[PDB]
Amino acid sequence: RLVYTHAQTPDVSGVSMLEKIQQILPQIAKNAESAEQLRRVPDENIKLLKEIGLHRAFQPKVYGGLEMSLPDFANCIVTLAGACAGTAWAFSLLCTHSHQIAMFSKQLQDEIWLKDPDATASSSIAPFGKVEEVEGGIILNGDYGWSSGCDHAEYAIVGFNRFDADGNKIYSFGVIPRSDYEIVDNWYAQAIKSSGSKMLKLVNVFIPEYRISKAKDMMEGKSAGFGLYPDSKIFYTPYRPYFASGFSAVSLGIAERMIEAFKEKQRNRVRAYTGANVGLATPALMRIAESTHQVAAARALLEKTWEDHRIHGLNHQYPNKETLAFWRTNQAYAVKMCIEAVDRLMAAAGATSFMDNSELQRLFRDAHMTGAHAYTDYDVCAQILGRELMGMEPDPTMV
Amino acid sequence: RLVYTHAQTPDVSGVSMLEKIQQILPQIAKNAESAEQLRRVPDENIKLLKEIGLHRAFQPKVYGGLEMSLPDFANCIVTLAGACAGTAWAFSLLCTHSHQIAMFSKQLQDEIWLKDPDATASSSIAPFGKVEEVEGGIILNGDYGWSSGCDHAEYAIVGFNRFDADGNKIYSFGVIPRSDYEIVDNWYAQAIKSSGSKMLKLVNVFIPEYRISKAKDMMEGKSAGFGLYPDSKIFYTPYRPYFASGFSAVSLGIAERMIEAFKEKQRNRVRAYTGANVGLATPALMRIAESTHQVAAARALLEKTWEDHRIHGLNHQYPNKETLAFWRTNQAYAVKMCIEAVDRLMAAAGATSFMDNSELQRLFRDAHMTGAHAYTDYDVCAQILGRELMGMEPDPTMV
Amino acid sequence: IRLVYTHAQTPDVSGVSMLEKIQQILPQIAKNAESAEQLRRVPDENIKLLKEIGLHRAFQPKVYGGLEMSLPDFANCIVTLAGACAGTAWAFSLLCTHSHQIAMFSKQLQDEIWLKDPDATASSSIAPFGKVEEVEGGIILNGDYGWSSGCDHAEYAIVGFNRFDADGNKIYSFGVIPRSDYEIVDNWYAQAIKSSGSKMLKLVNVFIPEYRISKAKDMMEGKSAGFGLYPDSKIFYTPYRPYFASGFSAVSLGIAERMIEAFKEKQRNRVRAYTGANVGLATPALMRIAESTHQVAAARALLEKTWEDHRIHGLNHQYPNKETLAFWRTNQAYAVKMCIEAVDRLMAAAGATSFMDNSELQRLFRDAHMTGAHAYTDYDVCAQILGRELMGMEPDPTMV
Amino acid sequence: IRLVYTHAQTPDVSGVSMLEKIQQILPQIAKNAESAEQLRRVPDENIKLLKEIGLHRAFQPKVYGGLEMSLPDFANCIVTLAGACAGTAWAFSLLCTHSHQIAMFSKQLQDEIWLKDPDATASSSIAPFGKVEEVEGGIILNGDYGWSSGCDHAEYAIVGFNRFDADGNKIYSFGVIPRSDYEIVDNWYAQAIKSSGSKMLKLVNVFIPEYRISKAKDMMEGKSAGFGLYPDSKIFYTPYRPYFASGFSAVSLGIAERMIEAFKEKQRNRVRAYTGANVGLATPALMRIAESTHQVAAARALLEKTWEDHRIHGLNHQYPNKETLAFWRTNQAYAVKMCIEAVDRLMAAAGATSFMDNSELQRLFRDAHMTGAHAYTDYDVCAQILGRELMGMEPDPTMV
Ligand SMILES: Cc1cc2nc3c(=O)[nH]c(=O)nc-3n(C[C@H](O)[C@H](O)[C@H](O)COP(=O)(O)O)c2cc1C
Ligand SMILES: Cc1cc2nc3c(=O)[nH]c(=O)nc-3n(C[C@H](O)[C@H](O)[C@H](O)COP(=O)(O)O)c2cc1C
Ligand SMILES: Cc1cc2nc3c(=O)[nH]c(=O)nc-3n(C[C@H](O)[C@H](O)[C@H](O)COP(=O)(O)O)c2cc1C
Ligand SMILES: Cc1cc2nc3c(=O)[nH]c(=O)nc-3n(C[C@H](O)[C@H](O)[C@H](O)COP(=O)(O)O)c2cc1C
């Protein structure tokens, strides 16, 4: 029998990553409050999650990785997000970054992992950096904002633009060691506080050519690492859908938790002004129902989208324009529904739900934060998909 | 690779029912306009659909039936609805009625089908009839509204209440031959005109005990036909989810077609006033995108819900309270989203789209009609699901 | 003097207000509604009743025997009227608001139309499809001119077209032409507002003299041939467009307030077909009636405020600035949008019986949606218009 | 005299309207907003500025030196104020509206409060949690009384509780008590409207004499001990509740209008972080700015019309009937809902940077949502209130 309201446990001989997550969820949940005030992932959380080996979800097998299918991984993040959004978000990123690193030169991966198999990377992909072409590579300078989990990373992946002959943009990534940059703690946010999305500062950082890949190359299986893992079900696939797979996941995790948390607080709710017993009043019930439907519908769409990714990966098959448009955008619609579903409940939650000591207020905030990311902006997404459906050239103004 | 915007063709060897539908879809589509003025399904359409054997979708195998899985059938109705909603709707009902007949006595099924293997039944399940208990059965009298396809049926299934010693409602159905009732043609509607939902008139109709089953019995596998088909993947299952499976189906069919129809008419559109080519303007695109997303999300939820029906059927497993609530209501949420998606497009359609000679106007009407059936009313559904989620006793005021 | 949230308040005038006069004839209009739908135009009775109370002279200059009603007072008669037959209200509103435009043409033209017959009115078709040849003394116009509400009951038609400069740039103009110069082609088969008789005008080598031709821009800025003719008037020193298009939102509002009333009446006694239960007062129904009431009351407030602004401007002989003009162009579109939300919220709890031919809701629902399909009520266009203005951007010549 | 859609119109009444006086001090209020949020109450400066212009005497009777402002004029001050610091506006609104209620108590009580100190104000906690013993001459009340906006700046508190009939039915009453009779407990750690200082009052064996106790029903129907005291006043012959709860929607509107302005400012120069192109004027953004503008203008129209209704009623010393009362109870709830939709439509295009502590939007978004979480602004309850009334049903004693 299927389950509509949450992740179904892959019954497998040998216990699943998702069960392993489920056992440690109470601890995560209890640190949630002190994680918010810490403005990063508490050391305990990292240690627990790494202990179950989650961070090696997308690490190639040759280095001791699991190579989880997207669905299985997504669902761990969703489940995780239910307990601490910021943790789930940050940790998702640390994880999905290995899937990218896996497309770089064999030499780079060897450098990172043969040395330390538990090493991970945070990122800052927005190309703010000023780049000088020296011989052998580049020198990069810049302030690189928004690096979730950067405190717990040994490397960072960093985005920038290079130019060819007709000084055209060549969008590239560089992997750099933790010693090459300072973490500046300017992370004072109002949602997903626990993700530690501090900013990386880069001063005359040299990056050799072998730690630099073209984005386009990693979208189309032409990067230096292509063909390295001929048996893998997850590497013969565009880098971006994976890396960005966390946002919607976290968002959905929040939504499903909101429903549960709202239901718990709803049962016993009294009317301040009259004293009457009001937890089972029809309006409340209808909201719980509709939000349940809405996130169930969102989970269906994400589940179907993830299956699509998995199937493609299995078959070592790069998607076409249309499927690519859908993979870029369905997640944004999912995120959008999930927020509608959180809002519908928060709106019936009453004043007490906005107190610091109430969980709803944090879920509500975090939920909204998931729709503020560049990759989840639905205005941009509607235009992307739309243009594709009418068979129009893409707008280079968005991506 | 998965498909977001429509039914995926089950790549069997040989001809799937769905391909067979797809080949006849142009003809159905061309009769659509004269079907609307006919106020019932044109004889051609019935003949074409019966020829491909679709009406035997849920007929037991022993009488020459196919015993299609719910998903496979649902998807034929969705596809069909894209060409003529009223046809798809009416015909869906004529089909899903066999699934119910199949739970009646062996004697009844023998009576209907050994005699004529192509016979089908229309229905009127709202218990308006006055019922006298005579010995050996009942005499029923009543005007029975809303019998989709009743012009093309050889039997009608007809709902009524019988009473205990306690004098409590026992909701029952009776199958009655076409000779036992007059079709009154009072079907003047403003949507799904082609369904021929005329009203059955019953005057002192006698119904023998063997043509009468309790609804509750068919919900719980206790009706006279339980056990008859020990190998069947579709009869060990409550009757209602199958019978009502066509509404959301039709509704989805209509939505997917709107998006196609809108896109076609959109390309070349000029502003009436300023005379400007305007088919590719950003707002239109964004509506095409989001309606696309919306119905895709609906399709995902229905596809997931149907899988759940299929799985249960396979395992001869009757669902529990919770899954039952979800099966009762997810369809209603799907219908709701589908109508939102139609409305979002009809609203950018401009005045020309409301002309009799435009398809959009019919799709828009028919789409709305699908949310007006008793089983798809979302207000009632949210209350049903809601009460279940909070662990409340059901409200006998709705069902 | 308590305010009223759910409908037009009756102006205590001297003598009998136009709105009371409408209110007395509303039953008759309402009883013809069903046969008007099958007639595909306004029934002769309705025209005769409405003209008898003098409504068609709502915007006719006083010198010819007109009333010169303020926008709010007129709008509110349409809203009320629309409650009984949307198509009648819509058609008739147009026949009415056309005089306000005629009043900006040459004194000679007005004299021609009204000194001859004071009850004469005009239908229109303003979308510039016509092919236009510049002959000397005026133009020859040819074209099929769609969508002329009330055109069966009109003696003239106002017709839109483009002329060109030296430099070949569009000069959007209107011409008033007699009923004898065109054929009404009956291609009006619609699924909403059937009774408006929006048939299409056919024009074959119609000659139009220069004096029956005004520039749209001139009528927007008080520069047309009729500017200054009525120095005491509270309604002519004002751009033509806001008035002419004032009817759409009005009708749309009329339909919404009526839906609420109609839904309430049918709701009381409603049963579930399935359970047998008397279900008219169930909390979900109540909440929908409430929220639809709030939503249309909120639309009414925005329209009433917008109308006041038109009135105030007209009083002061003051042409609005860019910002107010943007608001006048678009507030009505938002109102129309809310009204349709309000109708939908109710039709969605209406059940299957409400979609029958013999039910009023089905008509109101259809009509309500038709009011948001007009080119002037399209909200996507309006959001862009108002948006550009608020950010201080040049207007998009792509829409208007 | 041209109307304004996007904000309060300045009442031209020459000399300085209260609203102008507000507008001059708004920059200061705005600059303290950030440190007010961390203070979790209204900064002493803000109180001092606002009291200096005399705003707190908005509803104080004239005999004590009050202004007796009309509801519209006051409401609009709160709206304007809320644009700069919601929590200030909210708290101060309450301190203000409480005088309107005090004005219905015995002449002796008002004399006690104001003849002594004419600047004295009261905070409240109206939810009847208190346990109440009937002693002779009055009551002894005990309880923890949550949510007392501005309670740090008040000299008295108004406190709600239930007493009982012969056959012991709830008699809902209010008691005014001096600041010495209760402790302020600082448990106010919220995530919205932080600056309102809505701390909780603790009451230990507080004695309340009969003359500082009024029945709520009496103050709803002009039967309280202070009825008739100000025979010339335009604002006291009116149920107490619509005035006291007038601030919430007002604040909520204030925040919305400010969101639009704030969003517009930040939108202009917004690049993509991803591609590299002036993204501030993209069509989606424009349309959201447009539609939110329309939505809050429509909300403003409904509140403005509702306020006028209160004003007209007050003028005429006329207590409203069931229907208008249902509307006054609920329109504000709809207004608040629209305002939050409008805020959300913008916050959703605002991008990640808008959720930083150093961004104003994030605070506006939070505060905006908080206004819809009060017991009087809950729309579910409101739809059921209005709905039942419209269908002519007895009220549900389960909500109020
Ligand atoms: C109910 C209906 C009646 C109309 N009546 C008139 C009319 O009498 N005169 C006129 O110029 N346009 C009329 N219009 C047409 C519009 O002005 C405009 O040309 C049309 O809405 C263009 O929309 P489109 O993009 O669907 O073609 C009417 C439109 C509809 C909605
Ligand atoms: C398009 C249309 C077709 C219908 N066809 C049938 C049918 O054939 N058999 C049936 O028992 N009920 C049919 N129903 C009626 C519903 O089962 C139910 O009686 C009706 O929705 C009651 O809704 P109401 O509250 O408006 O009466 C149909 C309803 C509509 C929407
Ligand atoms: C921002 C905030 C401030 C409030 N300030 C007051 C106040 O000063 N006086 C008062 O009686 N109630 C105040 N209320 C509390 C409400 O009157 C009511 O008791 C509370 O909203 C009950 O809602 P609940 O169901 O969440 O408990 C306030 C509520 C919130 C939203
Ligand atoms: C919660 C939060 C965490 C983020 N974490 C990262 C990250 O770790 N790496 C990264 O490259 N971008 C991250 N982003 C930033 C986005 O990729 C992007 O630069 C940002 O959303 C731009 O949006 P804006 O238009 O508001 O500037 C994050 C954004 C938010 C919503």
Side-chain angles (χ1 to χ4, degrees), chain A residues 269-270 272-273 349-352, chain D residues 90 94 124-127 146-149 188 193 196 198 244 370 373-375:
Chain A
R269 177 97 174 271
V270 293
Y273 286 168
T352 313
Chain D
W90 175 289
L94 279 170
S124 65
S125 176
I126 70 163
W147 302 92
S148 209
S149 290
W188 170 248
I193 297 182
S196 60
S198 303
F244 140 78
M370 175 68 105
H374 194 280

Side-chain angles (χ1 to χ4, degrees), chain B residues 22 27 67 213-214 244 250 266 280 306 345 384:
Chain B
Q22 265 154 356
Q27 271 136 112
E67 280 185 40
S213 253
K214 285 194 266 282
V250 172
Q266 211 56 28
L280 306 178
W306 298 332
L345 296 173
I384 283 169

Side-chain angles (χ1 to χ4, degrees), chain B residues 110-130:
Chain B
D110 269 4
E111 187 161 289
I112 290 150
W113 288 315
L114 281 188
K115 173 166 130 95
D116 173 33
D118 287 315
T120 47
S122 66
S123 62
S124 174
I125 69 169
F128 306 115
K130 293 180 57 169

